[PDB]
Write a protein that binds this ligand. Sequence first.
Ligand SMILES: C/C(=C\Cc1c(C)c(O)c2ccccc2c1O)CCC[C@H](C)CCC[C@H](C)CCCC(C)C
Ligand SMILES: *[C@@H]1O[C@H](CO)[C@@H](O[C@@H]2O[C@H](CO)[C@@H](O)[C@H](O)[C@H]2NC(C)=O)[C@H](O)[C@H]1NC(C)=O
Ligand SMILES: *[C@@H]1O[C@H](CO)[C@@H](O[C@@H]2O[C@H](CO)[C@@H](O)[C@H](O)[C@H]2NC(C)=O)[C@H](O)[C@H]1NC(C)=O
Ligand SMILES: *[C@@H]1O[C@H](CO)[C@@H](O[C@@H]2O[C@H](CO)[C@@H](O)[C@H](O)[C@H]2NC(C)=O)[C@H](O)[C@H]1NC(C)=O
Ligand SMILES: *[C@@H]1O[C@H](CO)[C@@H](O)[C@H](O)[C@H]1NC(C)=O
Lengths: 33, 693
Amino acid sequence: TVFLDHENANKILNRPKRYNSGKLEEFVQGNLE
Amino acid sequence: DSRIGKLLGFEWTDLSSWRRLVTLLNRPTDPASLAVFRFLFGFLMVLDIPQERGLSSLDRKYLDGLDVCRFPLLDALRPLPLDWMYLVYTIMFLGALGMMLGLCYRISCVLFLLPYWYVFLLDKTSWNNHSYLYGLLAFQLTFMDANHYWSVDGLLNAHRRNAHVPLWNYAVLRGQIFIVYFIAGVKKLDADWVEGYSMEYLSRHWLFSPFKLLLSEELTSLLVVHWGGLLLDLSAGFLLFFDVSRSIGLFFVSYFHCMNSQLFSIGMFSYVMLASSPLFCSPEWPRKLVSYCPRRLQQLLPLKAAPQPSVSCVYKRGQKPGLRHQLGAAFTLLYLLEQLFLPYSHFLTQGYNNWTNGLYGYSWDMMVHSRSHQHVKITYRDGRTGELGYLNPGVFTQSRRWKDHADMLKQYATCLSRLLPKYNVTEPQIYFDIWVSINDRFQQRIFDPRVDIVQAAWSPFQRTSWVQPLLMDLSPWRAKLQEIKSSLDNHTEVVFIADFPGLHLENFVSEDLGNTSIQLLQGEVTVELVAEQKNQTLREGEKMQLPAGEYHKVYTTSPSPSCYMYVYVNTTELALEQDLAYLQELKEKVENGSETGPLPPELQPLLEGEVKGGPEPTPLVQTFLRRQQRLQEIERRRNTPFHERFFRFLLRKLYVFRRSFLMTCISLRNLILGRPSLEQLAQEVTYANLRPF
Ligand SMILES: C/C(=C\Cc1c(C)c(O)c2ccccc2c1O)CCC[C@H](C)CCC[C@H](C)CCCC(C)C
Ligand SMILES: *[C@@H]1O[C@H](CO)[C@@H](O[C@@H]2O[C@H](CO)[C@@H](O)[C@H](O)[C@H]2NC(C)=O)[C@H](O)[C@H]1NC(C)=O
Ligand SMILES: *[C@@H]1O[C@H](CO)[C@@H](O[C@@H]2O[C@H](CO)[C@@H](O)[C@H](O)[C@H]2NC(C)=O)[C@H](O)[C@H]1NC(C)=O
Ligand SMILES: *[C@@H]1O[C@H](CO)[C@@H](O[C@@H]2O[C@H](CO)[C@@H](O)[C@H](O)[C@H]2NC(C)=O)[C@H](O)[C@H]1NC(C)=O
Ligand SMILES: *[C@@H]1O[C@H](CO)[C@@H](O)[C@H](O)[C@H]1NC(C)=O
């Protein structure tokens, strides 16, 4: 987890993690973000 | 008697000289409204400390032995051990209760103010406008005499029971609220708010259901949410002040804050603002409210008799004001001027500037910027061997706000430079590459991908040289791009890129994503395939089909920025969906009586629904069963009465509060009486996490 392979490091088109996508700064996410 | 005197409450001659100004700002005034606001604010902060400040979650944020990167405003600040942090939060709670009950008011205000700002400055990732507001209100109330009415300290000391208070105690508070509105109003006069780009998806919430009866959704998302909010922010401060316009202002502001409370997860902000709004009313409203009640109730409610003379007000007979009065007037003037000036103080501290202005929290620009990140690459070069490697984007971090500010990026880079050598790495050099889009623009770099952040030069009062400018010239494209987003099927997806001259982007299309294509919208680009080392030269209006499972690089070779796009479809997902549809069709055919032939043995588990006494299901069967179970669970969740939801909400909050209290108790016991055996600690920690039920 502390290092990522060269192949997996560059995936621009990979689906972004949909965890609070399009989030505004003024929010209390909670549960350690 | 003057009309101006009636509207504004004072005559011009009162401002002629400094003495008369002090007398005006220290005139007698009734304290009831201030006391009610004190009680409400104390209650709200007491309910807020176990939830948002993070006492419920503090045992896995400052955990001992964990190596994490902090973001303090000053690098000198460092957290204490966990037990002392629990003690600090206990002091906060005691101060908040003291402010609520008005017992030892000044000590309570100090005990709440100092720890709150200590925690606030210890982490820049937890800054928000509604926290800075609580800090400012706590600072103000430390000097205001809010314990003169309805306070236990009033019972303890007779001389401070139902006594007069100076006018400035109200004035500052009123001014503060006005600023909180008015500055926001001028901050929202931006091209991204008046045009409907920010918060474009907030018009679909069901609370706006009635509005859709008279207007279309597109106009409902511009006239009501955006323009209405701006008008309310600008006008509410003036509407509440004047007597004639107070009622409509209160109604509109209450409706606005209720809708904000339901729509957002701000927390206690809306309730605090609702508590503060009546403060513009007459200073004696609670007393007349208490008067208009049955005598039986009056036997328990606060007093109704007139206030007594105090020593903290200048009375006209001529009395020469002392030192408290002059200091109060000077404090009012200076504090209001500082509050007005600070939001526009970004031309001095240019180091913290970015695409937006300054750190978030002290600008009052609420909900006027949305950011959507695409990818984050952290590359490191070892300083001894020259090997080049890549780190996980969010390692040794607890927030995700380091992707948008240069100072936080520098702090994170230094933290990595200090922690990595534990992993057999010599003095490293770290490069960052971050993609971010603000209010649905082209995705562009924010930090230069060729600059070593560890050895980069950064001071608070000098502009950073490695922050890419925002390409405002491509603002109008947001229209045309949107059309393309709505002209695609249910499977295809699009990602837009805008790149500066000289730089290049290296990408590796995953094997799953077949049929990936690149189209150029503006500029001149060159696309290189490294499998055979062949580079072509693409110009405007040209489409290419890139390989899947290999690397491709794109270079920009024009004097101006180049804008292009990726269009891709997940072929594996399409195949899985088609196969699942076929399986579901066969299942329906078997169910409805068609397909009289015997079912395949693999189909028998599907009808049975349980893998018992047979071969393990195929991956497709497992996926189908999981999807069916998920759909059934969702249907069960939706078909739920309100009372169950409310009960679950209350139980979850009760669990949070109980865990907070028990964790604080164990921490205090460990600090004071020493640490018992490790088995005892394990048992007590197990007891703390027990669900109430
Ligand atoms: C989300 C909105 C504003 C951001 C915001 C927030 C979250 C706050 O916590 C604020 C607290 C204090 C001061 C300013 C704040 C602030 O700016 C607009 C929300 C708009 C609402 C949902 C629309 C309905 C209300 C309008 C005013 C009704 C007008 C009706 C017309 C026909 C006139
Ligand atoms: C890959 O290419 C595009 C998406 O990258 C898609 O092709 C579409 O093909 C259908 C075929 O009738 C056309 O009607 C659409 O207009 C096309 N979309 C465009 C041009 O954007 C499809 O996802 C894939 N096509 C193939 C042949 O694999
Ligand atoms: C394809 O063309 C591109 C663009 O002209 C070449 O890119 C450059 O790569 C060379 C490699 O020796 C570098 O020295 C240059 O500095 C690069 N230019 C820029 C602007 O970054 C690329 O090398 C070509 N590919 C092949 C396989 O010949
Ligand atoms: C593309 O679609 C596929 C499905 O066809 C997605 O696959 C699953 O992806 C998750 C992670 O998101 C993996 O844990 C699963 O193993 C995948 N399923 C398999 C291999 O059957 C995939 O994530 C989508 N995205 C990409 C970039 O491939
Ligand atoms: C190499 O690094 C790992 C990282 O955990 C460390 O445990 C190990 O001791 C190192 N090995 C040598 C030979 O230095």
